[PDB]
Structure 1
């Protein structure tokens, strides 16, 4: 857990969004998410998990987290989940794929879920 240390802090995606995360010694991720796009305003609760006893020969550290897009300012009736890996070093990255599901009628269920890709770095 250069991993706990490496993951903890602020990350920015390609779109301008800001993730503030704390990694726990036993696999917890907790923090907040502020989105630069979509039906979003202010910050949202983040929760997830990461491999807290990670591999150690060049391989990344698997993780994931969820944000439900409801806070005191807005409710988009959607929740996004990011799955990917933390890669450390002078050019640290969290490379993720993200699924965003919206609540829909049965009829609209085939259009419930978006897929995208987010790359997070430590600098703006």
Structure 2
């Protein structure tokens, strides 16, 4: 199942660590530790996934958010990852990620970064 495949620890191409539980209903809950940026320690993560994906070889759609405030630091920013889980022997979560920082109105045009993160079950 998608639930079974997604739950656990994942690692992106930058050295960041995702620990997530996929609930029976569609919930994603866990923590995120970033190897980059104004970030230290782990941050709360919450999101959603399709709990009944197609069975035709298509991936499982999902997304999650981390606000970059925890017991260590507050970066006044939040990231969202949107993507799909791909199961099997070389399982992946392939994502694109938006990172929005709080800005003044004048600076809103430069508030949001776009990037792409690929997550694997073993460290890169």
TM-score normalized with structure 2 length: 0.99
CA displacement at 1:26 relative to structure 2: 0.4
Give the aligned length.
Answer: 123
CA distance in structure 1 between the aligned counterparts of 2:58 and 2:52, rounded to whole angstroms: 12
**2:35 equivalent in structure 1:** 36
Structure 2 unaligned regions, length at least 5: none
2:5 corresponds to: 6
1:15, 1:42 → 2: CA distance? 15
TM-aligned CA deviation for residue 14 of structure 1 = 0.1
4+ long deviations beyond 2 Å: none
Q: Which runs of 5+ in 1 are unaligned?
A: none
After superposition, the C-alpha distances for 1:39-95 in whole angstroms (9 at most, x for unaligned) are 000000000000001110100000000000000100000000000000000000000
> So what's the TM-score if we normalise by structure 1?
0.99
